[PDB]
Amino acid sequence: LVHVASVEKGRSYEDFQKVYNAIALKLREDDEYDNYIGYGPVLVRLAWHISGTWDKHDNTGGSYGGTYRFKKEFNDPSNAGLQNGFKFLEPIHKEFPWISSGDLFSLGGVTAVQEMQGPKIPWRCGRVDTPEDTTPDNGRLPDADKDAGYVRTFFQRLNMNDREVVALMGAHALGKTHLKNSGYEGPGGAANNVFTNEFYLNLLNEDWKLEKNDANNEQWDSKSGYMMLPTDYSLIQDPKYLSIVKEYANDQDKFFKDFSKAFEKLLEDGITFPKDAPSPFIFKTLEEQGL
Numbered sequence: 001l002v003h004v005a006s007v008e009k010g011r012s013y014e015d016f017q018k019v020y021n022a023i024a025l026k027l028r029e030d031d032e033y034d035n036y037i038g039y040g041p042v043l044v045r046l047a048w049h050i051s052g053t054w055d056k057h058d059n060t061g062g063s064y065g066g067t068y069r070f071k072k073e074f075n076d077p078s079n080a081g082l083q084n085g086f087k088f089l090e091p092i093h094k095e096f097p098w099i100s101s102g103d104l105f106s107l108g109g110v111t112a113v114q115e116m117q118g119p120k121i122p123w124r125c126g127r128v129d130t131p132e133d134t135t136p137d138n139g140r141l142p143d144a145d146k147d148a149g150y151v152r153t154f155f156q157r158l159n160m161n162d163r164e165v166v167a168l169m170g171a172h173a174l175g176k177t178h179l180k181n182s183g184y185e186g187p188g189g190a191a192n193n194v195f196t197n198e199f200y201l202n203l204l205n206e207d208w209k210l211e212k213n214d215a216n217n218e219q220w221d222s223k224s225g226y227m228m229l230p231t232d233y234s235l236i237q238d239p240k241y242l243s244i245v246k247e248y249a250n251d252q253d254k255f256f257k258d259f260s261k262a263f264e265k266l267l268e269d270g271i272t273f274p275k276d277a278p279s280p281f282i283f284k285t286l287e288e289q290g291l
């Protein structure tokens, strides 16, 4: 496969900035979801799960085809709970029927991070919806019950190296795990709907205790009321990953700069951009626009 980026016919920066402004205004408004966490966390988890099916060996999966819209990917056990992020974005797709599904699912993630006080993420338009038979089979998304060796081997299929993997995993400060979705339960820190380096600081400063939860799965619990997954806890058990965790814990700006670069790379894997294509757009936040 080659997947060439094609701009939605006739659309420019200001059209996309209107879809972003509409996702951000609805984030402001539906602030009660999941005990007042808001939809920001499930929207960046939707943007990474539609991108994480990519396989570098044959160019299949990835964000291009917007295939989550199909039953097979939608009903994938690893995608339980993302139906909430889909339902949120659906009125917005009726308001802007011209934007592709992959472009909308991925911009939902960019909007959520920037509106949660994260770094600016450059975003590129051009994904094209593809047929139901291009939909990737289930089982390409990662297990939580595993170690640092599995994590490194997994992220190599998306050719993400160590620093990219540690920066990307910093998004687990956001939101929480839910027992009925994944068999895990609990938050990862205090500020779980503001984007900060808190995941790293909690992983270095809490007194973590291994326990089984109500689903019979193990997780790392702390006195404070926080939890970490086995794969999260892996980042301080591996010596290469641990020097990077310490770097981000001492420097949130370096974390922002590296998360920005890696999240964009994750959203654009498997897509060729012609050089006639527009440069990546930097969207303004509501606040920047006075809205």
Ligand code: HEM
Binding pocket: 041, 042, 044, 045, 048, 080, 081, 142, 143, 144, 151, 168, 169, 171, 172, 174, 175, 176, 177, 178, 179, 180, 181, 182, 183, 184, 231
């Ligand atoms: C080895 C990698 C990863 C594994 C095994 C993993 C696993 C999980 C699991 C089990 C949950 C809880 C789901 C639930 O019960 O609702 C979760 C939540 C979440 N994940 Fe990951 N994750 C990984 C990588 C990432 C990456 C790379 C991102 C983002 C760049 C990400 C973002 C999120 C977000 C934001 C949540 C919170 C969702 C919410 O509050 O509803 N994860 N993850």
